[PDB]
Every structure is written in C-alpha cells, then in structure tokens.
C-alpha cells in the first residue's frame, strides 16, 4: 500500500500526535521547536562540531561514517538540559509509547548530524536494531525507541531530508532487506519542525545533492528504561547534573527508573538520588 | 530431579554443560576459604536491615533480609579478585556471547537471613526485566547468578532452594510450586550455587534458633539490559583503582551489544573520551 507522510502541528497535542504515530509509525510535528529555540540551540552547538573518527569497528560507525556529528549534548547545551529534557509534549508521547510495556523511559542518544554537499545518504534501517533482542523479535518487539528528529536548517528532498516509509512499523518481516532509500518519502520541513518515528519504522538520512548547503538535523532518541543507553551518564560531571530539574536528571541517567514496577539504576537497591544526596535546580550566584 | 555438583577445577565447559541441561549447578570451591574470610572481614561493618517504604519489585522479595548492595563501593576483594575471575568470565562469555555479546554486573549483594526468616516464594531472576517476563521460556539468556555461601548452607538454615530443569518448562507464567518442594543447595563456605535467570529458585526458610545464614548473590547480565545498580554511584577515584576488565563490569567502559557499541562518550569509546585511568 503506497502510503503518505502526515503532518500535524505541535499545538494538536500528544493524543492526536500519538494516534498518527500508531497508525503510520512516523509523523511530522510542525513547530516542535520554535525559530528562537533553533537559533539559540545552533548558537550553543556551533563551536563543538567535528567529523566522525573512523577505526571504531561498531554498528555506530556503519551508519555514521561521512557525517559531521556531536553527541552527549547534555554536556554542551543548556537549552537541551533545561528546555528539551522538560518538554511536556516529548514526555506525553514517551509516556504513551513506553508506559504499557516498559513503564519509565530515558535518553539513549542525541546528536547534531550535519551532512555536507555530496553526502551519499544512509541505507534505510530501523533504529531498534541497535538492541539485539529487538532485532530478534522484529515486528513482535516491544516499543524501545522514539526519535524526535528536528530540522535545524531547511530540510528538502534535494538537500538530504530524512527519508521514511510510513507503515513499515507493521510489516510482517523486519529481517527482509529494505527497499532503496529513493523509494522512501523525504520529511520536507522548516527549521524547528521535527520528524517523529519509532524504532520500528524504516528511515535514513537522504542524499545531499546540493553544491553549497549544509543540512543540519537533530536526532533525539528516547528509550525504554530496561535498555542500556547508547550514551553513558558517567560522562556528566555531578556539578552540571545538579543544575537540572529532577525530571531532566532522570532522562540523562542520574535517577532511579521503574521498569514495570522494578526499580533499576539504584544505590544499594534503594533510590539513587537519596543515596548519593543528589541536589537539583542549582543556580550559581554572582556573589 | 537432582541438583548436580562440579568442582571449580573442572573448568567452564564442564560447568556450562550442566547449566544448559539443568539450569543450575553447584560450583565446589568457587571462592577459597581464605577469600571468604577476607571478604567477610571487609563486609561485616556495613550491613543493615532493608528499609521499607520503597514500593518496588526489589522490596517484594527483599523485605525481612539484611542486605548490602553496590559492593564495589565496600570491597577491594570484589573490585580486584571477583570482577577479574577467569571462571566467572568464561561462563559469562558462553552464556551471553551468542545472543548478546558483552555482559556486565547488574547487582550483587550480601544477604543475611536471621533465625525465623520465613523464606522467599520461588521466582525466576529474569522477571526483573519486562521483555523477559513477556517472552518466558522463549527469552534469550539475560542473567547469570553466582550465589556464594559465606557461611555453611544447610537445609535447615535457609540454603537457597532450586528446581533443576525449570529453565525448560513450557509455561513460565504458571504459578510456581511451594518452596519446600525445591532442593536446597547444601554447601560449605566458598561453594556457590550457579543458576540462570530462567531457573526457579528462592532463599529458604531459616528454621534454626541461632544461625545467621550469609549468602552472596552476584548477578551478571547481558549488556543490552540496564543494570539494577547504578554505576554513577561509584566515585571516579575508586573506579581508577580497578583493572580495565573490572571497570567494564561495574559500568564505566563501553560494551558491545552484538557489534553495537553502547555506553559511549560521543558515540565513541567511553574510557578514551573521559581519559579514564586504571590500576
Ligand atoms: O498484505 C498483507 O496483509 C501482508 C502480507 C504479507 O506481506 C505477508 O505476510 O507475507
Ligand atoms: O540524520 C538523519 O537524517 C537520520 C539519522 C539516522 O537515522 C541514524 O543515524 O540512525
Ligand atoms: O539469597 C538467596 O538465597 C536467594 C536470593 C534471591 O533469589 C533473590 O533475592 O533474587
Ligand atoms: Fe536511523
Ligand atoms: Fe532470586
Ligand atoms: Zn492531551
Ligand atoms: Zn505472512
Ligand atoms: Zn513546516
Ligand atoms: Zn576450558
């Protein structure tokens, strides 16, 4: 069935957005971030960007070679820590996706991904293939990941807009070789618009056919708390973590999370934040 | 059926075979007498009662016990001897290598049951992970429990009870039998009862008037699953005293999930990115 990529404003709310996500596996959120947020986030991000270093021999390297990438963005962005990790729409959607089979959720990875002119694109893939039990289960897998992929520049068919196959989250055989990326639908989007897809939906970065345009995307992937994050929370200094809200702290791997009633990521099997005396919403004063 | 026993010297292949067939095996002399003495010496002064009011899966099974967890924080012998043990690593490589790749520590505790302690209901350890509860028998291997006796383990004093073969039963959601139908792992100090997360087991009833029965569960887990014990509780200073391999077990290095690097810094190697020292 030759399907369509649907588009829905941020103001429609999480119920309406979640419904298209269930039916299609992917939806465009218009105005996920405002223009002002995109400007400020870009300002914070610019000076830390660089090329992906080859020689890793990993799953990451197979899909991320040729891209400019920065990850562990809690370390580099106040707007990430304070605005995005407390966003009510993000949390409403995560509660609906992950609540039934997993309970709690948290950040697995977030990156800024900039594709240069001539970048050839990715093969279509499902994001849940980073987790081996989900690869084994295929369609029968529980929901494990949710990717909020925000456009930080214009996203066009020509400049490499992320390509998606609506409905692929419901195909019978997830191990079948995926189709060519050019049969998929590019998520044409203005800055601040985000393409939202589960870890079960076939997608990939498009070919950048321009001569002079750097196409900047912002994947932010939330994950079921029972699965180990791609990005380690031990990289964050305690001092920085203590500037965030309790909820943001929990997303970045410094609080206890409940896996269907099972407390995990604990200190002495009890609450983590209590055990280590973790502070929150700290604000350093000019003194 | 019977609970089988194999000496530590027989090696990982022989031990792994009984584990596949029975889901549970006694390793004679997993730790030496001298290790048990020294480990006990280190552990003694930090023990306390489980605090109620947690409203968790942990609390449902651990109420009434004395417990200490996050044992890398309290024991040099844990950090240096146990986290580098060749037999532990040989068995984990065999259990987890096929479906998961790497593995690491999820939880380890000292569990002391007092006289009168009523025992646990029989349970499978993989029910701490929701996807494994859903899959039941069809679940991939997720956990391996090396449960070492730190005092004598007797039928009467609450030796851990196990049902050999329960890892192969068709229906994992069927209500388990009474704990007193299961076989107690009678053991000397340093012997360990080894079982997968799919095998029905539980701490026994302590029917003595005067014996404190001290067990030492050490649970390794497939790296794709979040640990029960958080690695952010460990200060960096302490982690840097351990070997690279021990560091990896306690959640401070990158682990490979069937070729997928996870627990990374900037998607690259964690230890490199944060400049992590060792030994
Ligand atoms: O059209 C359908 O319902 C799916 C059929 C199909 O692709 C299959 O099961 O092989
Ligand atoms: O950056 C994009 O457009 C897609 C990235 C992606 O799908 C991935 O790297 O897993
Ligand atoms: O300490 C014992 O004997 C068994 C403990 C146990 O099975 C558990 O707490 O999961
Ligand atoms: Fe992807
Ligand atoms: Fe248990
Ligand atoms: Zn609503
Ligand atoms: Zn079919
Ligand atoms: Zn738009
Ligand atoms: Zn051998």
Query: Is the backbone of residue A8 left (phi > 0), alpha (psi -120 to 50) or beta?
Result: beta
Experimental method: X-ray
H helices of chain A, in order, are 14-24, 35-45, 59-64, 78-82, 88-98, 132-137, 238-241, 246-251, 272-275
Domain A1-287 class, CATH top level: mainly beta
Residues framing ligand 3 (Cβ under 6 A) = B 61, 111, 120, 125, 160, 201-203, 215, 217
**Cα dihedral value A61, A65, A71, A76, nearest 10:** 150
For tokens 């990158």, the residue is B254
Distances in Å between the Cα of B19 and the Cα atoms of B70, B192, B243 are 27, 13, 28
How many CB atoms neighbour CB A239 within 10 A? 10
Testing ligand 2's pocket by substitution, the residue of A25, A153, A219 carrying the most ligand atoms inside 8 A of its CB is A219
Gap between the Cα atoms of B78 and B82, Å rounded = 5
**Cβ-Cβ contacts under 8 Å for B218 (sequence gap 6 or more):** B82, B88, B105, B108, B145, B146, B147, B148
For B259-278, letters b (16+ CB in 10 Å) and e give: ebbbbbbbbbbbbebeebee
Atom of ligand 2 nearest to the CA of A127: 10
Residues of A in contact with B69 (CB under 8 A): 266, 268-269
Distances in Å between the Cα of B12 and the Cα atoms of A260, B25, B30 are 35, 12, 12
Instruction: Say if residue B136 is exposed, middle or buried (CB neighbours under 10 Å; 0-12, 13-18, 19+).
Output: middle
**Cβ-Cβ contacts under 8 Å for B109 (sequence gap 6 or more):** A269, B67, B68, B69, B71, B216, B217
Atom of ligand 3 nearest to the CA of B219: 10
In CATH, the number for domain B1-279 is 2.60.120.620
C-alpha angle A10/A16/A18, rounded to 5°?
Answer: 95
Instruction: Record the tokens describing residue B89, joined without a space.
Output: 């690593």
DSSP secondary-structure letter at B187? B
B25, containing H or E segment: strand B24-28
**Cβ-Cβ contacts under 8 Å for A212 (sequence gap 6 or more):** A117
In chain B, where the domains are located? 1-279
Name the residue among B4, B35, B163, B24 with its Cα closest to residue B91.
Answer: B24
Beta strands in chain A (DSSP E): 7-9, 26-30, 68-70, 105-110, 112-115, 145-151, 163-164, 185-186, 194-198, 203-204, 215-224, 257-259, 262-264
**8 Å CB contact of B267 and A111:** yes
Atom of ligand 3 nearest to the CA of B215: 1
Instruction: Record the tokens describing residue A150, joined without a space.
Output: 């925000």
C-alpha angle B160/B214/B229, rounded to 5°?
Answer: 85
To what resolution in angstroms was this structure determined?
2.2
Residue B206 and residue B114 in contact, taking contact as beta carbons nearer than 8 Å: yes
Q: What are phi and psi of A232, to 5 degrees?
A: -75, 130
Instruction: Record the tokens describing residue A263, joined without a space.
Output: 């407390």
Residue A222 and residue A105 in contact, taking contact as beta carbons nearer than 8 Å: yes
Cross-chain CB nearest to A56 (options B70, B225, B261): B261
CA of B201 to the centre of ligand 5 (A): 6
Cα torsion angle, A83, A86, A87, A93, sign: positive
Name the residue among A135, A202, A199 with its Cα closest to residue A171.
Answer: A202
> Widest CA span of chain A, in angstroms?
64
How many CB atoms neighbour CB A86 within 10 A? 15
C-alpha angle B205/B206/B210, rounded to 5°?
Answer: 170
Cross-chain CB nearest to A228 (options B128, B224, B267): B224
Gap between the Cα atoms of A55 and B160, Å rounded = 47
Gap between the Cα atoms of A56 and A152, Å rounded = 28
**Cα dihedral value B84, B90, B92, B93, nearest 10:** 110
Look at residue A25 and give its three-state secondary structure: coil
């Amino acid at each position: 069935s030759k399907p369509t990529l649907r588009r829905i404003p941020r103001s429609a709310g999480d119920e309406a957005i979640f419904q298209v996500l269930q039916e299609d596996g992917v939806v465009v959120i218009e105005g996920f971030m405002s223009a002002d947020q995109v400007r400020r986030f870009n300002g914070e991000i610019d000076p830390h960007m660089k090329q992906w270093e080859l020689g890793q021999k990993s799953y990451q390297e197979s899909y991320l070679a040729g891209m400019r990438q920065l990850s562990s963005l809690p370390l580099f962005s106040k707007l990430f820590r304070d605005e995005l990790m407390n966003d009510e729409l993000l949390h409403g959607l995560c509660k609906r996706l992950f609540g039934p089979e997993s309970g709690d959720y948290w950040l697995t990875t977030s990156s800024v991904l900039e594709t240069e002119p001539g970048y050839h694109g990715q093969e279509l893939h499902r994001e849940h293939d980073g987790i081996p039990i989900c690869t084994t289960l295929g369609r029968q897998s529980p929901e494990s990941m949710l990717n909020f992929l925000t456009a930080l520049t214009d996203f066009t068919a020509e400049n490499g807009a992320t390509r998606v196959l609506p409905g692929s989250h419901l195909w019978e055989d997830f191990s079948a070789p995926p189709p060519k990326a050019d049969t998929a639908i590019p998520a044409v989007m203005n800055p601040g618009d985000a393409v939202l897809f589960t870890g079960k939906t076939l997608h990939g970065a498009g070919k950048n056919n321009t001569t002079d345009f750097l196409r900047r995307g912002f994947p932010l992937i939330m994950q079921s708390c029972q699965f180990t994050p791609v990005e380690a929370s031990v990289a964050l200094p305690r001092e920085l973590v203590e500037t965030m809200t309790p909820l943001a702290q929990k997303m970045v791997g410094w609080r206890t999370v409940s896996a269907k009633g099972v407390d995990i990521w604990t200190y002495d099997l009890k609450d983590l934040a209590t055990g280590i005396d973790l502070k929150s919403n700290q604000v350093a004063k000019k003194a």
